[PDB]
Amino acid sequence: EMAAFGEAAPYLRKSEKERLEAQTRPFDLKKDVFVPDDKEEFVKATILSREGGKVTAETEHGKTVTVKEDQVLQQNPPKFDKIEDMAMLTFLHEPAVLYNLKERYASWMIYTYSGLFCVTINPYKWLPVYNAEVVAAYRGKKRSEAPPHIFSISDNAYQYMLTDRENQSILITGESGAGKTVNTKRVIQYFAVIAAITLEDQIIQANPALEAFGNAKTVRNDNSSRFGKFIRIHFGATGKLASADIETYLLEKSRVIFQLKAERDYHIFYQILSNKKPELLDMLLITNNPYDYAFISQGETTVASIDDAEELMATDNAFDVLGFTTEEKNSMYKLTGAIMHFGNMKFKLKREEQAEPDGTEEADKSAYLMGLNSADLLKGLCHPRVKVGNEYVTKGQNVQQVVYAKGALAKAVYERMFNWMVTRINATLETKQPRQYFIGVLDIAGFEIFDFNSFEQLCINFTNEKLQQFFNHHMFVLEQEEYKKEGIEWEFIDFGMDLQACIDLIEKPMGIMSILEEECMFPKATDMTFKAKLFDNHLGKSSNFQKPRNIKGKPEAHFSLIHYAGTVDYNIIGWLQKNKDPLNETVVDLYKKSSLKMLSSLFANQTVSALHRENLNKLMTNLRSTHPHFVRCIIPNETKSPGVIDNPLVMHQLRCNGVLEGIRICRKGFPNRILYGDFRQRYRILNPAAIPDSRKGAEKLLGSLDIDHNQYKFGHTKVFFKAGLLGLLEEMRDERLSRIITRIQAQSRGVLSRMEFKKLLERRD
Amino acid sequence: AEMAAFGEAAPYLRKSEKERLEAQTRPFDLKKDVFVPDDKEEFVKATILSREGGKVTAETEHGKTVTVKEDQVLQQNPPKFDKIEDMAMLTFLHEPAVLYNLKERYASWMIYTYSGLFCVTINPYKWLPVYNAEVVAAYRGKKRSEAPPHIFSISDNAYQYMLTDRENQSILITGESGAGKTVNTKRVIQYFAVIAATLEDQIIQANPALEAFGNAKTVRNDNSSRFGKFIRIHFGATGKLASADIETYLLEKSRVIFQLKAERDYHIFYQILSNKKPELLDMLLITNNPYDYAFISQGETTVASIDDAEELMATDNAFDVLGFTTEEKNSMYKLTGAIMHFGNMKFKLKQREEQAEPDGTEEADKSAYLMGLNSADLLKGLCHPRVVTKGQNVQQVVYAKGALAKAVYERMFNWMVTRINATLETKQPRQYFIGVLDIAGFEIFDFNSFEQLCINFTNEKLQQFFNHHMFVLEQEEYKKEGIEWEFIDFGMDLQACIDLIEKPMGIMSILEEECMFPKATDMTFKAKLFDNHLGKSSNFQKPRNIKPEAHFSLIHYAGTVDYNIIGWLQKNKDPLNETVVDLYKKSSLKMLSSLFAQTVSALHRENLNKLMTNLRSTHPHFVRCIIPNETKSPGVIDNPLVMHQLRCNGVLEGIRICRKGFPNRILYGDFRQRYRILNPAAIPEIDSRKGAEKLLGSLDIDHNQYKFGHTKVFFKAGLLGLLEEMRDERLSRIITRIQAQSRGVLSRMEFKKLLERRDS
Amino acid sequence: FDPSKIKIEFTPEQIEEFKEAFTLFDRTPKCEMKITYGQCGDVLRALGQNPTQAEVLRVLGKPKQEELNSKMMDFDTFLPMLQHISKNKDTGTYEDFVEGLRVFDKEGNGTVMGAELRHVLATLGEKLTEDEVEKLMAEDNGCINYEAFVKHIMAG
Amino acid sequence: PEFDPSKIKIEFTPEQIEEFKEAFTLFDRTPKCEMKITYGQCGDVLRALGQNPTQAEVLRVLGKPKQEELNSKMMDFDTFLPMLQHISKNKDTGTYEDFVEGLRVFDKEGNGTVMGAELRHVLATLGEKLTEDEVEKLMAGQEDSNGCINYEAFVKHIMAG
Ligand SMILES: COC(=O)N1CCN(Cc2cccc(NC(=O)Nc3ccc(C)nc3)c2F)CC1
Ligand SMILES: COC(=O)N1CCN(Cc2cccc(NC(=O)Nc3ccc(C)nc3)c2F)CC1
Ligand SMILES: Nc1ncnc2c1ncn2[C@@H]1O[C@H](COP(=O)(O)OP(=O)(O)O)[C@@H](O)[C@H]1O
Ligand SMILES: Nc1ncnc2c1ncn2[C@@H]1O[C@H](COP(=O)(O)OP(=O)(O)O)[C@@H](O)[C@H]1O
Ligand code: VO4
Ligand code: VO4
Ligand SMILES: [Mg+2]
Ligand SMILES: [Mg+2]
């Protein structure tokens, strides 16, 4: 029964009436098909005529179409309606997958198994499927009794960890706004609730704190993650929650001081200005108007779906639960306020080509909150010190030069404060409790295309490209390698899933990052010397490198990159300065000599592309020493419409994700495998007589069961199971365990009854 | 000599045409001349006397009369194959063919041999005239046919691959302790530095400076590297030397304060005490006697093969060339002297309390003076660390004193590496790099502790890196590219042993968890290892005690090692007296103050996995160093010892994948750029694959030696050698025609002058 | 009737030994040799049988709770029930019982935490009461050697 | 007794013969103005008359002479004319594409340019070596503003001349 799930039950599994309806729905296997459609990818149809190799059918809308025999695809019988695992479908093709997902989504069932991985479609509506009752309902359930859910993936990962004695990872892929952060937080919720049957409280509150400083509204997502993160949840040898840690990657510095038309800066600025805590506005010496602060009011200032006042309470509470002191919280708020004032520092030319301050009010407020001298700050910005050899002299600066430097400093303070907060959360999450394994959760900034794509979009989209290749390598390369290495009869299948050409274009020597890195080491280099080197080395040489596709009215670009998820047009302006990240060292020295301890410590401590590439390669290795579990998030439409599916948009995501190819390797291969010793430990209970040696034991045990003997293979060190065999052996184990406990209880009842009878016999009325 | 620009090195690199002919015409019969197994020499040469019912009776080279089965007899390679340069070219490839080719080249002092795409080198234990600027000059650009096997040849090929393929390279030098990894690492650097010729001078001097502080005499090597290192040599887009950097890994801290019977501490201590620079003994307030200093005189103090006086001059000169100031050099010498005094500080228990107090102040005074500390503060910090003070017994103070000396030394070594890197960094643009890996090699002592596990685990991981590249990734490459290929299991996989050491519930993991239990003992750690692995993990066994006692055995790739688990918890945690560390931060010596401004197994495992990724993004080139005997005897080969190394290295399996597979591959675009010259008519001036098919099909070559992949053309190494000879000859013919045309122009220019005087 | 088709295979000596045993359960004031439907299972167990709660309810003819508390039964209606229950021999092996308890052994060592076994026995299968578990269990650290425990429950 | 030049058929028109006779005469360095050339200045007269033979090809028509024969063995126009006819027969002089592919070997970055000093080195060290004098005369002028040669433009230049 679905009774243990409460109100969530209909949103997780269809009713008994509906499965009786599916079981008795009339169907014509010869008539009921799928045909291509120029606007909907594929449509359902009934064949009218049929022929000479041509089929004439009646569409579900419905029009009359005439297509070739080869273009027609069979529909799965009604028994397969809203199927939980799409690897179990009789006919596996693009519209079978699409229509199974569409039909489950129409019923608000947003999770579907795709063999050993999961597919999830964004509902754009909150459903009652994520509460402690549903967490408890799933605790220990492995498929059959458990409908698809993020809690199921999390639980299955936990069981693999204990059985296989290896570290796990839950890798959540998807475009911007697909649902990666939502699902990441539900994996954490699962493990924290299970542990509560505080570290659990602190693990949950780490994300509201980070999202305030690292998330922002973009054209694609109202709560877009502007940094990547890997959360490791540590466990003891017997599986008890031990500790946690967070690793963050490359925060988008430019958002602090710049916003595009339909974008907001980081949430925190608007959370403070909401006036929910009026004492913060007084402490930071600010008004309640965002249009008064230059760095923060370039794009949008309010979001219909966000209550900045309520979110400020969530942020401030998250810090309290995380054990941040009043000085810690106040120092963070004060530095945020200092950044706000810093942007309002105005400058003018002296008839000379040198900048001087316009006013001093905002500089005074900035310096006061930062524990600096404003006369020193303004002199440092207008006349930075330069070393000749023996003496210290000043450099000249025009307004454009000071404005650039003012921004660079603000971004450096913000990014370092974000880094401090991560380190401070980690100091809390660390328990000194013994660990043996971990379950790692990966939440990257997803694939995105804006009207204007710069360096930050390249870094983001490169990370997404690398993650899809990680799926491709595990599913189609390492998987087939495993069979061969173990002596399983296997013929290699080429799945056509390899993004090495594009990855090589970006990260290998003479690639985009390498050319950029070399150009940064040339003092006379410009954006256009960089644009020329890219063209000279890649146009007509690298297939993924193309000319831009510029349109009048829309912002122009310098080149196109054919990424896995689409072609992105990139603008190369300011990439050298962005990669080098120069800072005014005169002002940095004032920050080091600051009377505000947090600021003093932030600056006490080569290029962005070098560091990004290092973090990515480090990440890819931590993940290679892990058993990965993929969650493929899908955006249903481009208008944030709940329950609405845009067929071409969903199909494009399923294709570039390699969902079908992924299901195929699960169906054709042997997705589950266990060492002979571990097999004996777990499945001897099925028939102890067959195992009174470990390989012969497995051969005797399995051969003694009423199963399809073509569904398992014997390897050098492991038994390999076909898709569906594990699910059967798990049902058979559970039923047999239930029968044995019942017999242990019957025997126990006999003992107790015989004990009391002995008392009666000894003479006791 | 003939085709030698190699000078005096020529006979040590390639034999004369006179020898080539004596070999070729020597007595030999393919039916008689064979190899038979031997219980003492692995295999021996033999001549078949009789053959009946599947049994062969032969005459040994020594010679005895043996009767063996048909299946045990192996064919000798004909005289044409004597001392062959590449063993992948041998007609009969088996264990004695390889062994005897290597033995015969070694007998001629030819220590380098190609093994397909990798190289084998046997330690000569004698310096040969093969490593000079003249030999460097002679290898520059030479192909494997015009260039005899040498470390300069591997280095140059790596350089060519880098420019053609546009990818980073690595030269990975494997071997047991004393095999020759540091020698060959330094010759890779010499090659590139000489080719470029102060960056060149500084790159060469970085190793004498590091070796003084990071190398020491062990029972296996008089100059044993006690740290690992990865040297990256950076190059510009066109291949010009740009910069260099050094990454060092885990220096053996314990050697600073402890030595086993047949061992010395780090070289520097003995270099200073040599009295070659008598002003250092006066500056450091020390005598010339190592037996006066506790920390450094536990084992041996002199090495017959080392002149500590001459080596001190090499160390001091290396620092000068590296641009270290007088304050930088003096501070390093002073801290070395401070460590020497620190070891001589004695303590005793108080009359009525289990609390330590000083037993003398002389060596403490000298230590504090050189360290820019107050000795009253130092002694109070060691006896009463602040928490209000903690109590300390003599055993506790002695341990803490040692831990602080090791921490100063290791951090000073780390500072020196950073300071060398600051010099090696030129702000010159770069595009590629050639990385050189020099690890501390496989070793077995009478007493093996935590430091031997870390060392031998690194060696185990490196052999698996060879196994993965050669037999896994290689076969994977053919499949992903659509080349007709049947998977071969080479029996080269050390995952079971690697899993026993680094995976959850393994040796490192159990140790890490035990460190998080305050009540844990070495014996509670020994119990957990046994409970989880004895009769569960094949590579984990009981110890084989005879002399010093061990707790378990580990079946490593290169042998079974018996490990002693005493003090592993303290070694892994590495606790330090924070009160004394605070005095070092407040030190009047800038160096010590700058130096001090989770576990060893966790950090080691992180460095190893970082290293394996930097290496996975490079094209690797393996150099397999072999120890010939156990007595450091030049020109002497111990057959079982050489064979054991060739086996556990997988040299034969490695040659086989090169012969059977397609070791060379090139993208279609790059193939057109390089080989269109062979026949430009076949590729008129779209489509790059069709172009390659038309070009290759138009040549008088074996068409079974290349295959067309999705993105690349795959070649047999032999076919690549032929195509390179064909390209060079065709380039020579084209230049000759360009010169004939150029001669016609010049002659026509002069004729025009003559004509203008009389006819025009 | 279903009990009427069953053949009494017990010796007259056995019948009388079950008859003498049955007397101790009789709580009738006039000693008319009668037990309630709800105490049948307890008498079946006293006489050496080990039926499940489901098996007892089946021989009783699927009674209501009211029939269990207040419906009476004499030796003549009980004896055929005892014969039927006596026929079932698929009571589970020692190896099945060890394999069942081994599921809860988190590590190698043939031990299970006392609190876990008490929980399993009171929540899974045909749930034992917290009273029955306390009486049955009354452990070393607070762990049970489940192979010994199986030998203990099977001997009793 | 027979000869190899005797079997060669003179296919040039009488007008062509007389044109070649005057060209041969302009190379005269004899003290008596006898209108004869040394064996060593034959290549020059072959090249002046539009041929582009290699040093090896010239030495073959001359009958593999010694250096002494090259410096001092005299030759009349009648012995020269059959040699000019033989050299005129060779058409495998190398294509424009071969010449570009040859110089492309030295293009380190795929520019379509080669460093001046490298081309001067290659031409003076590889194949049938040119003298440092011949290379200076051939290269000037010249390299571009940076000191590089657009090989392919250089090939068009040497083939037009
Ligand atoms: C369907 O329900 C589940 O998800 N589970 C139920 C029971 N499982 C326990 C247990 C049974 C037999 C085999 C697996 N080991 C697994 O096959 N190995 C794994 C390892 C690496 C790769 C790439 N593929 C496969 C083992 F965990 C754990 C989850
Ligand atoms: C002196 O003899 C040589 O070794 N060389 C001759 C010419 N080479 C230039 C060029 C020609 C043809 C193909 C290769 N590329 C190489 O096969 N790919 C390489 C890269 C990945 C891995 C694991 N194995 C294969 C090459 F670079 C450079 C050296
Ligand atoms: N499972 C879900 N239930 C409800 N809303 C969701 C769900 N997944 C996504 N959303 C909505 O979509 C928004 C964007 O999702 P998010 O996890 O931030 O995307 P990503 O991290 O992939 O960019 C969320 O803020 C929420 O409004
Ligand atoms: N190529 C060689 N030429 C001369 N001596 C060598 C050579 N290789 C090794 N040796 C000798 O062997 C010793 C140990 O070599 P080394 O590089 O330190 O070994 P490893 O670093 O593998 O332990 C050297 O000090 C030297 O005496
Ligand atoms: O919207 V995202 O969180 O993918 O950046
Ligand atoms: O002797 V070694 O350099 O291998 O440590
Ligand atoms: Mg997100
Ligand atoms: Mg060494």
Could you write out the three-class secondary structure of B141-179? CCCCCCCCCCHHHHHHHHHHHHHHHCCCEEEEEECECCC
CATH of the domain at A757: 1.20.5.4820
Query: CA A763, CA A765: separation in Å to the nearest integer?
Result: 7
- Let me know if residue B709 belongs to a domain: yes
Q: Is the peptide bond before B482 cis (omega within 30 degrees of 0)?
A: no
Query: CA A660, CA A471: separation in Å to the nearest integer?
Result: 13
* DSSP per position, B53-90: TTEEEEEESS--EEEEEGGG-EEPPPGGGTT-SBGGG-
Question: Which residue's entry shows tokens 């037990």?
Answer: C35
Q: Is the peptide bond before D141 cis (omega within 30 degrees of 0)?
A: yes
Question: Which residue's entry shows tokens 């009461």?
Answer: C129
Query: CA C25, CA C29: separation in Å to the nearest integer?
Result: 12
Q: Which two tokens stand for residue A318?
A: 């998250």
Interface A–B counts its CB contacts (< 8 A) at: 71
Q: Are strands B55-60 and B169-174 parallel, antiparallel or unpaired?
A: unpaired
Q: Which run of H or E residues covers position A279?
A: helix A278-283
User: Which residues of A are the active-site residues?
Assistant: 176-177, 181, 221, 224-225, 446, 448
Of chain A residues 541-560, which have a CB less than 8 A from chain B? 541
Any CB–CB contact under 8 A between B606 and chain A? no
Select from A741, A747, A753 the Cβ nearest to the Cβ of C46: A753
Contacts of B498 in chain A (CB under 8 A): none
Query: CA A547, CA A526: separation in Å to the nearest integer?
Result: 20
CATH of the domain at B65: 2.30.30.360
CA angle A118, A124, A125 (to 5 degrees): 105
The answer to whether D139 and D127 are in contact (CB under 8 A) is no
Give the bridge partners for B541, in sequence order.
B553
- Let me know if residue A278 belongs to a domain: no
Beta strands in A598-740 (DSSP E): 627-634, 672-675, 712-714, 718-721
Contacts of C102 in chain A (CB under 8 A): 685
Single out the catalytic residue among B115, B184, B185, B225.
B225
Q: Are strands B552-556 and B356-358 parallel, antiparallel or unpaired?
A: unpaired
Residue of D nearest to B730 (CA): D102
Chain B: list its partners (3+ Cβ pairs within 8 Å).
Answer: A, D
Beta strands in B440-516 (DSSP E): none
Tell which of C43, C103, C129 to mutate to test the A interface (max A CBs under 10 Å): C103
Query: CA B3, CA B11: separation in Å to the nearest integer?
Result: 12
Fold of C1-87: Recoverin; domain 1 (1.10.238)
Give the bridge partners for B620, in sequence order.
B170
The answer to whether A330 and A320 are in contact (CB under 8 A) is no
Does any ligand 4 atom lie closer than 6 A to the CB of residue B124?
Answer: yes
Nearest C-alpha of chain D: how many angstroms from B637?
Answer: 45
A178 annotated ligand-binding residue = yes
Question: Which residue's entry shows tokens 């502790």?
Answer: B449
Query: Cα(B470) to centroid of ligand 4, in Å?
Result: 26
Contacts of A616 (CB under 8 A, 6+ apart): A462, A463, A466
Residue C24, Cβ density class (10 Å: 0-12 exposed, 13-18 middle, ≥19 buried): middle
Query: CA A745, CA C124: separation in Å to the nearest integer?
Result: 10
A136 annotated ligand-binding residue = no
- CA A120 from chain centre, in angstroms, equals 12
Q: Method of determination?
A: X-ray
Q: Which two tokens stand for residue A473?
A: 């390598």
Query: CA C87, CA C10: separation in Å to the nearest integer?
Result: 12
Resolution (angstroms) equals 2.5
- Annotation says B182 is catalytic: yes
In this complex, whether C and D touch, counting 3 or more CB pairs under 8 angstroms, is: no
Any CB–CB contact under 8 A between D53 and chain B? yes
- CA A149 from chain centre, in angstroms, equals 16
CA angle A627, A157, A200 (to 5 degrees): 120
- Alpha-carbon distances, residue B585 vs B373, B380, B534 (angstroms): 10, 16, 47
Query: CA A233, CA A193: separation in Å to the nearest integer?
Result: 13
- Let me know if residue B109 belongs to a domain: no
Residues A682/A687/A690/A694 CA torsion (nearest 10 deg) = 0
Q: Would you give the DSSP letter of residue A4?
A: G
Per the structure, the count of domains in chain A is: 1
Of chain D residues 21-40, which have a CB less than 8 A from chain B? 22-23, 26-27
Q: Are strands B74-75 and B33-38 parallel, antiparallel or unpaired?
A: antiparallel
Length of chain C counted residue by residue: 156
Domain that holds residue A699: 673-761
| A273 backbone φψ class: left, alpha, beta (φ>0; ψ -120 to 50) | alpha
B367 annotated ligand-binding residue = no
Query: CA C146, CA A76: separation in Å to the nearest integer?
Result: 50
In this complex, whether B and D touch, counting 3 or more CB pairs under 8 angstroms, is: yes
Query: CA A262, CA A515: separation in Å to the nearest integer?
Result: 32
Contacts of A434 in chain B (CB under 8 A): 513, 516-517
Q: Which two tokens stand for residue A717?
A: 């060190």
- CA C86 from chain centre, in angstroms, equals 12
- CA A644 from chain centre, in angstroms, equals 23
Q: Which run of H or E residues covers position B418?
A: helix B394-424
Q: Which letter, b or e, does each residue of B495-516 get, where b requires 16 or more Cβ atoms within 10 Å of its Cβ? A: eebbbbbbbbbbbbbbbbbbbb
The answer to whether B616 and B608 are in contact (CB under 8 A) is no
Query: CA D63, CA B23: separation in Å to the nearest integer?
Result: 40
Nearest Cα to Cα of residue A2 among A18, A21, A24 = A18
- Let me know if residue B261 belongs to a domain: no
Residue A457: phi and psi, rounded to 5, are -75, -30
Give me the sheet containing B112-115, strands edge to edge. B112-115, B118-122, B619-626, B169-174, B432-438, B228-235, B241-249
Nearest Cα to Cα of residue B614 among B438, B753, B437 = B437
A697 annotated ligand-binding residue = no
Give the bridge partners for A241, in sequence order.
A235
Query: CA B667, CA B166: separation in Å to the nearest integer?
Result: 11
Question: Which residue's entry shows tokens 């260039």?
Answer: B147
Question: Which residue's entry shows tokens 């200076």?
Answer: D136
B480–A485 CB contact, under 8 Å? no
Query: CA A547, CA A555: separation in Å to the nearest integer?
Result: 15
CA angle C33, C34, C37 (to 5 degrees): 155
Query: CA B420, CA B206: separation in Å to the nearest integer?
Result: 7
Nearest Cα to Cα of residue B272 among B316, B236, B228 = B316
| B435 backbone φψ class: left, alpha, beta (φ>0; ψ -120 to 50) | beta
Q: Which letter, b or e, does each residue of B522-536 get, where b requires 16 or more Cβ atoms within 10 Å of its Cβ? A: beebbebbeebbeee
Give the bridge partners for B120, in sequence order.
B113, B624
- CA C54 from chain centre, in angstroms, equals 11
Query: CA B302, CA B311: separation in Å to the nearest integer?
Result: 13
* DSSP per position, B564-630: --TTHHHHHH----HHHHHHHHT-SSHHHHHHT---HHHHHHHHHHHHHHHHHTSEEEEEEEE---S
Residue D128: phi and psi, rounded to 5, are -95, 80
Give the three-class secondary structure for A174. coil
Nearest C-alpha of chain A: how many angstroms from C155?
Answer: 9
- Annotation says B441 is catalytic: yes
Query: CA B590, CA C76: separation in Å to the nearest integer?
Result: 104
A518–B609 CB contact, under 8 Å? no
CA angle A108, A112, A118 (to 5 degrees): 130
Q: Which two tokens stand for residue A429?
A: 């999450």
Query: CA D120, CA A720: separation in Å to the nearest integer?
Result: 67
Nearest Cα to Cα of residue A620 among A471, A762, A518 = A471
Query: CA A550, CA A117: separation in Å to the nearest integer?
Result: 39
* DSSP per position, B712-731: EEEE-HHHHHHHHHHHHHHH
Q: Are strands A64-68 and B664-667 parallel, antiparallel or unpaired?
A: unpaired
- Alpha-carbon distances, residue A670 vs A482, A486, A532, C77 (angstroms): 10, 12, 50, 58
Nearest Cα to Cα of residue A590 among A370, A332, A399 = A370
CA B92, B93, B95, B97 dihedral sign is: positive
Q: Which two tokens stand for residue C38?
A: 């709800």
Residue of A nearest to B517 (CA): A434
The answer to whether A550 and A372 are in contact (CB under 8 A) is no
Pick the CATH number of C88-154 from 2.40.170.20, 1.10.238.10, 3.30.930.10, 1.10.287.130: 1.10.238.10
Query: CA B306, CA B304: separation in Å to the nearest integer?
Result: 6
CA D146, D148, D150, D154 dihedral sign is: positive
The answer to whether D143 and D116 are in contact (CB under 8 A) is yes
The answer to whether A126 and A646 are in contact (CB under 8 A) is no
Query: Cα(B622) to centroid of ligand 8, in Å?
Result: 16
Nearest Cα to Cα of residue A684 among A744, A725, A732, A745 = A732
Q: Would you give the DSSP letter of residue D62?
A: T
Q: Are strands B552-556 and B169-174 parallel, antiparallel or unpaired?
A: unpaired
- If one counts every other C-beta atom within 10 angstroms of the C-beta of residue A354, the result is 15
Residue B277: phi and psi, rounded to 5, are -115, 90
Q: Would you give the DSSP letter of residue A266?
A: B
Query: CA A571, CA D36: separation in Å to the nearest integer?
Result: 73
Give the three-class secondary structure for B38. strand
CA angle B696, B701, B703 (to 5 degrees): 65
- If one counts every other C-beta atom within 10 angstroms of the C-beta of residue A21, the result is 13
Contacts of A593 (CB under 8 A, 6+ apart): A600
Question: Which residue's entry shows tokens 């190896």?
Answer: C95
Give the three-class secondary structure for A26. coil
Query: CA D6, CA B138: separation in Å to the nearest integer?
Result: 49
Contacts of D101 in chain B (CB under 8 A): 676-677, 680, 734
Give the bridge partners for A113, in sequence order.
A85, A118
The answer to whether B152 and B95 are in contact (CB under 8 A) is no
Tell which of C124, C134, C149 to mutate to test the A interface (max A CBs under 10 Å): C124
Question: Which residue's entry shows tokens 């060893």?
Answer: B600
Q: Which run of H or E residues covers position B225?
A: strand B224-225
The answer to whether D119 and D139 are in contact (CB under 8 A) is yes
A518–B430 CB contact, under 8 Å? yes
The answer to whether B172 and B623 are in contact (CB under 8 A) is yes
- If one counts every other C-beta atom within 10 angstroms of the C-beta of residue B611, the result is 22
- If one counts every other C-beta atom within 10 angstroms of the C-beta of residue B351, the result is 7
Query: CA B431, CA B414: separation in Å to the nearest integer?
Result: 27
Count, in order, helices (H) and strands (E) of chain D: 9, 4
Query: Among B75, B100, B130, which residue terminates a domain?
Result: B75
Long-range Cβ pairs for the range B301-309 (8 Å, 24+)? B301/B264, B301/B270, B302/B270, B303/B217, B303/B222, B303/B264, B305/B222, B306/B217, B306/B222, B306/B223, B306/B267, B306/B270, B308/B267, B308/B270, B308/B271, B308/B273, B308/B274, B308/B276, B309/B271, B309/B274, B309/B275, B309/B276
Give the CA radius of gyration of chain C.
18
Question: Of A122, A175, A176, which is best to mutate to test ligand 5, by the most ligand atoms within 8 angstroms of its C-beta?
Answer: A176
| A581 backbone φψ class: left, alpha, beta (φ>0; ψ -120 to 50) | left
Nearest C-alpha of chain A: how many angstroms from B674?
Answer: 15
Q: Would you give the DSSP letter of residue B391?
A: P
**What is the crossing angle of helices D132-139 and B717-758, to 10°?**
70
Nearest Cα to Cα of residue B481 among B696, B671, B674, B665 = B665
Q: Are strands B432-438 and B169-174 parallel, antiparallel or unpaired?
A: parallel
Query: CA B276, CA B307: separation in Å to the nearest integer?
Result: 11
Q: List the domain boundaries for chain D.
A: 1-89, 90-159
Contacts of B246 (CB under 8 A, 6+ apart): B206, B210, B229, B230, B231, B232, B417, B420, B421, B424
A553 annotated ligand-binding residue = no
Select from C46, C125, C135 the Cβ nearest to the Cβ of A742: C125
Residue of D nearest to B685 (CA): D97
